Write a protein that binds this ligand. Structure first.
Ligand SMILES: *CC(=O)c1ccc[n+]([C@@H]2O[C@H](COP(=O)(O)OP(=O)(O)OC[C@H]3O[C@@H](n4cnc5c(N)ncnc54)[C@H](O)[C@@H]3O)[C@@H](O)[C@H]2O)c1
Ligand SMILES: *CC(=O)c1ccc[n+]([C@@H]2O[C@H](COP(=O)(O)OP(=O)(O)OC[C@H]3O[C@@H](n4cnc5c(N)ncnc54)[C@H](O)[C@@H]3O)[C@@H](O)[C@H]2O)c1
Lengths: 317, 324, 325, 325
């Protein structure tokens, strides 16, 4: 068993746990410890009841400083700073840090120092890390040497695969993105800050000063829509683009990217493990060179499963 | 005073009336008749109360074939055919048809035959009508021979002015749009309140019709989200002239003060959709959301009140029609 | 095997099917035919994708005149009137009529005439059917000679069990209810941002089931823009003096005993959506129980207004097909 | 005219200002100072644009140490402590404290010490206070001596008038309330507001018993938050001595609305939804169509209110009474 600890039991941490069990990737990975400065029972409870994904199918309990998913007893810690984490004592192979506060080399080193073999951050974190993984695209680029890695963000993890597929096939010249985020808020469309372009140009440096992004928050549940527009060199038609993407979903990107032409709405992709689901019915091409594609993703669940995918790769290399 | 009749007292019809009074444009134009298939009080009530806005500031009464807004009398009719409309009897200068059912030439002729000097449709309709007016862009192209005219749609009326401004300044090569609307196809039989729902958009067709130079150069998609009243349009265009985000913003800001005052607005304030509720502008450009990818791919987000803006344009166009 | 046909594949009909499979009651019941005046391709699609309940876990297919949940084939019919239904040909033991249009005796007789042994309506029907079953309360009064029966409504099915429990224990003198539903010049308007009064058939339904409460029960209801789960705010005057926690203890005991699987009890800090897809007819929220003086009880009861009811349809169906002489 | 300063420019503070100008109580009250921790420009923005009330009709300019509503020049302070407030310098007749933090009479004394003649809190207060005015019910009990007074809460200000009317006419024996509110302590608090019905704490049970001490151990209350806009619904249930019918109750309340409680309580039988009462200055609007009576003694009444606007106007009403008495 690969044994992981989770630092920070927020939304993403909780989902990683839920995902571990539902995906059955329990067989290959046991969570041994969770750490959040937050009261233990608020965790057990919040793990059991989730606003988007239903009651957790497994039986959850929290007595003492011990969380319980099914028959597993997860030791619950309340450390405030990285050094005093008993990673060594627990034999932690990978620490998934989902705190959202920690993210630099030093934080990584601190985790390793505390006894963890490797670290995986649930966000981009400081630039200079031993690696950055958008699973399904560049997991093959992982080494032994690589011990402090970032898993990108849920939005970058959603759109990067598509941008790659499109760039490889048609040569992207420039791109612009609009992200429609789910959640006064409960009536408006709210313009919000977005880091998604920084994330794209970082992963694809050939796109510096060639990509921009805006984003809005709307009062929907759980699922996010990404509205991607790119200029390409090779002339293309809407259905050719769709055929490319559909093929990718059945081939090289099976399980990571999905494709659909069914008449669906956002909530239908709730609890969908894919990093991205391409909506074929929304694909457009203006002239022969401006491609619009709408990509759905469960902004938490997809990412959560990628955390686990990346973890496995890290522990295996 | 120009006298108008309203055919169809739906959402848009009601707003046109509300707009007439609130805009203060009651001094130039008067509503003499409304023709509806619903009950009469049905109308008075819905005119007084609506969920998009607030209680109508004016006092709304209702008696049988009548309707009262303030001191003004408005003959309420219930005719299922245009032939039998007493437009002649009432001296109607313009009929604003907001039924959403009528829209070809013949329907226009029918209204005129019934005694109306001119007709204005609250939508695109079929192609061959005298002119489609996107007020603030091409109202100067109204001759008096134009008797049956279309007011475009609220979304086309929102984005066309921006597309013109950008094309004039930088030469648009191709474009793509996403419309985020507020609240057959199997998507239609399912809950609005938690989902982003792809819907059919005819915005594409409307743009290329108004700008024929853009055939096979514009596409559009749209989604419906469970927000109130205000619509966001996410426009992306490739241009010839190289540009920077703030140059684009400066252009649009200038237009808002200048040539397009009262039709397009510009803002850099941190606002959300509901802040544009009841805003008379056809379009409000959100400067903070302008982007340029490379030097040639412009993204601009434009807000509009999808009913109020359009409702005021109906009145603006009406005036223009009655004045030429 | 008990073999059922479903007349009307609307919201409730679809859920009955989903419920049959998810609850494993499919070992004991078979849906052999569905009839709806709707596009059969659309039937399959709507069965697979639901706004409340998510993607149906089973594999759904449609082709010509067959729907396919899993490896099962259901005959899809399109008859516009009750007379021409091939119930006899298919050996239907019970017809679950979830059309919401049909509900008289005659409609029942028509179904039986068409070849169905018994009929179960997904609503309270007219006033004089053979039985109304609020399962868990009076299913023991089903005899084998009741062939046209009503399953009450989801709201009545939700609150009746609680009213019984309270009446038995303390003697209800009078009652008033407020129902908060999830999503006439009010229907003609924007449901995404308002509390909307709506008419309710609940006071009718209660006094019908408990005739001793005529002119002693009233009800109002509002619609709010939430998802799927309904809250019932019950207020009753009782004879026996009581305290909040006594009432809670009574109800909690019922939930573990006589009403296990039908009524549930909870003290956990939950919100409506947590009862989404809950099979109980009613879940009592202990934390919201109150008693004013010693005689005015307030209790808040949650229910999944569709799922609970759907599973009760199946429960009642079984009882009807089983009830021996 | 009467001069007022506003301590705390939150939701309520902002609305008081908006109300002053819109209601037309501007020919009777002037705001001279707003003391607030955030910058003069933040203040001005939020005053102009509101999530729940639209664009403020007046022109909101900003300059120097001044806000401007029309040609009226209001002054902005950022005094962190209470003693350093220049109330004396500005000749403040009443301080409306809408901070929600201050509410003890020491706080009151502090304001007065700083130079304010009288103080009015936008909530119940931490108490041992001079008075508690639910305007339209007991403003006549104000005395030149009461210098530190509380304006109750918006919910108490909404339902108290109705409870009085009902008690006077039929003698309330006991009561229970449900409030339907729009949008570490609880585990419910940090959960998605968009889509669930959310049970929460409520102090209405107290506020009522405090105002009507004859109801100790005779009133209880619960409340839920739903994702609607701005307007609040209060679902009141009371037992009464005198036997009554639904329409008698309605007739009583309707009469009150034109008569003794004109401008404070309103009555309607029109088919309306919550948003229709948005920006309604009444403390309470009674929905006749929802009135019920179970037996002859259990009254259910549903009362709407704009939980901010009504209250804000009452703040102004109470202020006037205080400065006048
Ligand atoms: C934003 C925008 O401009 C937009 C977007 C999509 C579609 N439309 C067009 O708006 C027009 C009507 O909108 P409205 O919501 O006002 O219509 P409604 O749904 O409220 O109903 C119309 C109203 O008229 C009645 N009616 C029907 N037929 C009638 C006749 N013959 N005579 C009198 N009244 C009639 C109907 O019962 C209801 O009361 C459309 O053009 C639409 O395409 C705008
Ligand atoms: C039901 C009812 O009547 C109701 C509804 C809402 C709120 N209340 C009560 O009124 C008090 C204020 O609540 P509100 O929500 O208006 O406040 P806020 O969160 O909008 O912001 C307060 C405001 O005060 C400023 N402030 C804080 N500390 C300050 C000091 N020391 N000096 C000056 N200003 C200060 C703060 O920055 C913000 O601008 C509550 O009691 C509530 O129960 C009633």
């Amino acid at each position: 068993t690969v044994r992981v600890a989770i630092n920070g039991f927020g939304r993403i941490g909780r989902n990683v746990v839920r995902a571990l069990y539902e995906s059955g990737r329990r067989a290959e990975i046991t969570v041994v410890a969770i750490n959040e400065l937050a009261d233990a029972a608020g965790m057990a409870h919040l793990l059991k009841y989730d606003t988007s994904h239903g009651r957790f199918a497994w039986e959850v309990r929290q007595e003492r400083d011990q969380l319980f998913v099914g028959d597993d007893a997860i030791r619950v810690l309340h450390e405030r700073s990285l050094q005093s984490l008993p990673w060594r004592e627990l034999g932690v192979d990978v620490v998934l840090d989902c705190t959202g506060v920690y993210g630099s080399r030093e934080h990584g080193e601190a985790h390793i120092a505390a006894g963890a073999k490797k670290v995986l951050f649930s966000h981009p974190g400081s630039n200079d890390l031993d690696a950055t993984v958008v699973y399904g695209v560049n997991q093959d680029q992982l080494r032994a040497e690589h011990r402090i890695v970032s898993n990108a963000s849920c939005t970058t993890n959603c759109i990067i695969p598509v941008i790659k597929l499109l760039d490889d096939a048609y040569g992207i010249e420039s791109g612009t993105v609009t992200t429609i985020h789910s959640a006064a808020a409960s009536q408006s469309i709210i313009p919000v800050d977005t880091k998604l372009a920084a994330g794209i140009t970082r992963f694809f440096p050939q796109f510096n000063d060639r990509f921009e992004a805006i984003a809005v928050r709307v009062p929907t549940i759980n699922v996010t829509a990404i509205d991607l527009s790119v200029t390409v060199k090779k002339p293309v038609k809407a259905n050719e683009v769709n055929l490319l993407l559909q093929k990718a979903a059945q081939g090289a990107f099976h399980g990571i990217v999905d494709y659909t032409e069914l008449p669906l709405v956002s909530v239908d992709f709730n609890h969908d493990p894919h990093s991205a689901i391409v909506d074929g019915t929304q694909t457009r091409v203006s002239g022969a060179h401006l491609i619009k594609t709408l990509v759905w993703c469960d902004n938490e669940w997809g990412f959560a499963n990628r955390m686990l995918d990346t973890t496995l790769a890290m522990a295996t290399v």
